[PDB]
Amino acid sequence: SHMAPLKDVYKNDFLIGNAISAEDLEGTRLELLKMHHDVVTAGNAMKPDALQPTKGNFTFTAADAMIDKVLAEGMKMHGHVLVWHQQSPAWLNTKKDDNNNTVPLGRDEALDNLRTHIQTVMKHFGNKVISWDVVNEAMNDNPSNPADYKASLRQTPWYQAIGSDYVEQAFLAAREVLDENPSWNIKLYYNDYNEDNQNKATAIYNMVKDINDRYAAAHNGKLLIDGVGMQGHYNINTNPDNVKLSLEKFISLGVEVSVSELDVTAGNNYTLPENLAVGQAYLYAQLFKLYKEHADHIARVTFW
Numbered sequence: 001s002h003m004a005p006l007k008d009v010y011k012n013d014f015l016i017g018n019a020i021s022a023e024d025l026e027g028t029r030l031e032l033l034k035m036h037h038d039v040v041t042a043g044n045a046m047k048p049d050a051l052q053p054t055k056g057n058f059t060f061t062a063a064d065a066m067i068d069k070v071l072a073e074g075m076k077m078h079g080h081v082l083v084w085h086q087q088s089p090a091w092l093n094t095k096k097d098d099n100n101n102t103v104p105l106g107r108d109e110a111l112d113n114l115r116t117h118i119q120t121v122m123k124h125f126g127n128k129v130i131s132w133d134v135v136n137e138a139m140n141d142n143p144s145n146p147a148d149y150k151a152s153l154r155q156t157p158w159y160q161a162i163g164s165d166y167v168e169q170a171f172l173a174a175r176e177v178l179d180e181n182p183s184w185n186i187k188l189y190y191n192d193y194n195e196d197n198q199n200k201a202t203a204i205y206n207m208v209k210d211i212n213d214r215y216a217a218a219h220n221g222k223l224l225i226d227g228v229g230m231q232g233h234y235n236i237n238t239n240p241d242n243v244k245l246s247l248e249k250f251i252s253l254g255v256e257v258s259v260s261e262l263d264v265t266a267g268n269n270y271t272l273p274e275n276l277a278v279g280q281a282y283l284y285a286q287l288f289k290l291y292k293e294h295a296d297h298i299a300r301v302t303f304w
């Protein structure tokens with residue numbers, strides 16, 4: 001419940017977003033969506049399982065209905081998500097062996113599927129989105145050696161098929177689509193959660209800095225990764241000082257930052273309903289005060 005239209009309050013600071021399903025585009029839900037938000041994210045409709053459920057059967061119909069309705073209603077669209085370990089069909093990066101066990105594909109076949117998916121889906125929606133999450137949730141939680149970002153990457157199905165360079169290869173494939181369609185203004189994001197954990201933030205920073213420093217040196221200073229998304233699945237024991245330290249660390253890469261899936265839930269420990277509501281309201285207030293203070297480098301704040 002918002003007591004003043006949020007997109008109006010924050011119009012000079014950052015886009016205000018919400019994640020939606022098709023139900024949100026009808027009735028009182030659509031009026032609330034429009035009044036408070038400038039930008040939407042599809043909760044599920046643009047994920048790899050929703051867009052390419054089997055090899056070469058691209059299924060864009062429902063996604064196109066959603067994004068055309070969002071634009072007709074005067075809102076923008078953030079694309080979520082080209083490459084993820086969850087909600088991603090097995091055929092992209094595994095096969096069945098002769099005894100019907102699931103095993104990884106080889107690197108070349110898996111790259112080919114990775115590039116084809118990214119490049120087909122990006123070209124289908126074109127500039128109907130303002131941004132894409134190119135890769136989501138690639139980094140382990142609480143990595144013990146964050147100075148070595150490649151050792152800190154989750155051993156997901158893409159990592160097991162392609163190797164530690166697959167995040168870089170995903171962004172190179174998406175950047176080639178934009179190079180070939182120069183009039184599209186679309187920001188390429190890396191998105192992850194638990195970025196208030198300082199080790200995980202250091203690992204993410206080291207990954208983006210390596211990828212972007214090598215790309216910029218070869219491309220007249222142009223960055224590869226334009227944005228870091230902080231998912232913001234926080235709880236009432238999240239320390240807003242740790243959110244500020246990571247926010248500032250990502251700003252120091254020269255990228256924009258967005259908050260992509262913000263929600264505040266109870267902690268580990270048993271809370272009790274009034275104490276829970278006070279904790280949630282106080283964190284939200286502290287986070288928006290921090291975001292306003294850094295608005296020159298925050299493009300969007302989207303709720304879950």
Ligand SMILES: [Cl-]
Nearest residue numbers: 194195231232
């Ligand atoms: Cl986060």
Ligand SMILES: [Mg+2]
Nearest residue numbers: 013014295298
């Ligand atoms: Mg801003």
Ligand SMILES: [Mg+2]
Nearest residue numbers: 181182183184
């Ligand atoms: Mg063009």
